[PDB]
Amino acid sequence: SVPSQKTYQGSYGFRLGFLHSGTAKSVTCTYSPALNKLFCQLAKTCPVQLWVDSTPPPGTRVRAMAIYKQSQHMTEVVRRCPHHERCSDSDGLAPPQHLIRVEGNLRAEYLDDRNTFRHSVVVPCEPPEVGSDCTTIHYNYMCYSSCMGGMNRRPILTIITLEDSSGNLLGRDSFEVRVCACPGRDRRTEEENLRK
Ligand SMILES: CCn1c2ccc(C[NH2+]C)cc2c2ccc(-c3cnoc3)cc21
Ligand SMILES: [Zn+2]
């Protein structure tokens, strides 16, 4: 099966937000609103903001999962490639097979679904720090889009779901991801292709 990617704000008005990082050659993570696409370097911090219009209950959680974007590949589990799953870059918590990690959150939990075999990472939903308007999760993507035997140049989506304590759906948002060596140049190139 294929997890839903339908945008759903739900009762709490859940949606993502992204910083405005620009497209300089040196940028390590940059988001294109026109493409709804995040471009990032391998294993580098990707800040993703969480926004709600009203406060969700204690025990609400936030899950991230990757799927292939193209219909002919969406049934295949997105995982790290045969090299990266063996490179012993573990953070002590993420299984080495998982593409998506959460950085710097000791409460992150990693799921291998017993039925679909898909990977996901889930954290408690926390309120913004005093003085802030939103909460930020720091994600890492642990393979390049081009990795042979893994993503192998196939585009992926990240689906972020807001869930209750049982795992029921409260909200959903999503964005395409390209993990690449030069996110700034690739964002500029793909945005110009879209314009042309
Ligand atoms: C999704 C993260 N988030 C927000 C993001 C933006 C804004 C709006 N600021 C102007 C408010 C919240 C907010 C309020 C409460 C909680 C909460 C309580 N208990 O668990 C989670 C989580 C919250
Ligand atoms: Zn890889």
List the domain boundaries for the chain. Answer: 1-196
156/151 Cα distance (integer angstroms): 8
- What type of residue sits at position 72? Q
Resolution (A): 1.4
Q: Which residues line ligand 1 (CB under 6 A)?
A: 50-52, 55-56, 58, 60, 125-128, 133-135
* Determination technique used: X-ray
The secondary element (H helix, E strand) that includes residue 17 is strand 15-17
Q: Which atom of ligand 1 is nearest to the CA of 132?
A: 9
29/42 Cα distance (integer angstroms): 10
86 Cβ contact list (under 8 Å, min separation 6):
96
Q: Find the largest Cα–Cα distance for the chain.
A: 47
Ligand nearest to the CA of 54: 1
| Nearest one of 102, 99, 85 to 154, comparing CA atoms | 99
Copy the structure tokens of residue 33: 């609103």
Strand ranges (DSSP E) for 41-113? 46-51, 61-68, 100-102, 109-112
Give the three-state DSSP class for 120. Answer: strand
Give the three-state DSSP class for 191. Answer: helix
What's the angle, vertex CA 84, arms to CA 78 and CA 86, rounded to 5? 115
Concatenate the DSSP letters of all residues of 129-185 into one string: PTT-SSEEEEEEE-S-TT-TTTTTT--EEEEEEEE-TT--EEEEEEEEEEE-S-HHH
Determine the topology of domain 1-196 in CATH. Immunoglobulin-like (2.60.40)
Q: Are 62 and 102 in contact (CB under 8 A)?
A: no
